[PDB]
């Protein structure tokens, strides 16, 4: 129901962040602009499948 997720940067693919979401409230792959340490800038991170 509420599960752990990992957000991968959409530029370099790196799984930079882990978080949780409630699957019933947010069933779709979440996206968040977060700092990617590899790219040294804020980039869109999308939940991995």
């Amino acid at each position: 129901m509420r599960v752990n997720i990992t957000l991968a940067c959409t530029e370099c693919g790196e799984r930079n962040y882990i978080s949780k979401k409630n699957k019933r409230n947010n069933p779709d792959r979440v996206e968040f602009k977060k700092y990617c340490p590899r790219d040294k800038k804020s980039t869109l991170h999308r939940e991995t499948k």
Partner: protein, 573 residues
Amino acid sequence: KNQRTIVKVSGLEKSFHLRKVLQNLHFEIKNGDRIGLVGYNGTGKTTLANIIFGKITPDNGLIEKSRDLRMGYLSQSIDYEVSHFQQSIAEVEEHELFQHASSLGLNKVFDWSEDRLTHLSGGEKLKLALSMVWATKPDFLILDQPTNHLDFTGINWLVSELEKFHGPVLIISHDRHFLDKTVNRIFELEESRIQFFNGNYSDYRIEKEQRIANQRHQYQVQQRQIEKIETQMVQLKSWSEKAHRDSTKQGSASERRQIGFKEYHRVKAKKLDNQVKSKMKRLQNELNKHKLEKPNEEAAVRFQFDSHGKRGKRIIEAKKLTKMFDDRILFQDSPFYINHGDRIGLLGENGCGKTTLIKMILGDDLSFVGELWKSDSVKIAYLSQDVADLSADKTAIEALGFTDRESILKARTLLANLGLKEQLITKPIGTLSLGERTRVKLVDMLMKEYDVLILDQPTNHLDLPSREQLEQTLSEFTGTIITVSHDHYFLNKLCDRLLVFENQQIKRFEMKPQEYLNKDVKSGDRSEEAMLIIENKIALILGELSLIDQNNPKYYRLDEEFNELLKQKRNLK
């Protein structure tokens, strides 16, 4: 060529929201397999097929298939494929496609306008969709819900063609009879787990019963064991408590004071406790080792067309009724009527105009010649053949359109009885399975306070429990029922009169669907009267001769007449 595995699925998992649809499915499709994928509505059959085809990516698992494999997919949203037919003409070798088409009964498809091609019968859509898939020369056929709208012709065609097909075929169907002719294996998808059965669908049914019976029996045996041991434990406990309680109160005053008295008795109590602990531990360990889960308790679809009051005799009359489309006459000078309580089956091949007439009766189509009278006081419920009527965006409640709490409660309660729970109600209809969409349309019918039921192909997209429940209910309904179905069994059970679409004429026949087909031309009906009377005399004389000894003088006269009458029988034949 061989039986090399063509499609191999392993550990296929797929979920939607929180609902697991497919849970750990391992199966292989080999060359020449004719597999029936069965299971009730919403079990995931279309979902599975789409994953096999590749329209939906699974959450876990691998799908192994030849990289070059061509997979012909009949799909459920024919509307999309048929709308692209104009585009398909440029991409497919015209010749082969049209060769098939004519066999399926779509004659001269070349000449159809884009209007007609957008106005097709649902049975025509399927016939056109089938011809397209087979002209593409696929190596693997997936046929989601075929024979739904097909007539006798298209079913004979689809059978004879499936048999010929060289590759494997996966058929998703609820039609017992179509499966009983084309498939040799059944994939039953229940509780998100696929079970395998050998043979056709009828034997699957039988074998499934036995598996359920065996499973049920075994579960009961285990439960009996558990209860036995719990009864033991309860008894031993009680004893242990009593033992400790009495440890200090036994014997006379002096004997109670003996040294070590209560310790002796309490030691005995401790032994009883050890038995309980051992019984418990063993029971727990045994369950962990082997704990059968309670067998599935199949849900029971329940819905009843509550009977209305009394109304009047006439409800429909047609005089010199003629319907045309541009220059094509659908039917001409066709007089018929329907009275209250008639159970009318509309019989006719695909495209003959069955659905057209219904739209005229409802008043959606006013473009006809003649008089078509309908009682103004007739409230009609109407399950439409075209499932795509409902906007596949609205939720179940929005499609019903009820706003007051009382109406909502009835609608929600009925939906729940039909197996659509809160989860599915709040979702856009576009997500519902094709049979779930049909249970939503049924609720819109039940919530109407009506007098007539028009059921246009009521057995497509419906599982055995829903079809069986519908059959029971419709047999009890005292109002008028008009049903179009090419499932002749369903028609033959429900309908007692027929409107036949033949040669651009609608004729009413006062007989059951089964009798009409098995008729035999009356070319010699003026002579059958003679054959009937003479033969009945033969029976009378033959009967008497059976009871009399040859030595009775009465025997001689009867034998002469018998031989003479037999000569007459020969002369008439």
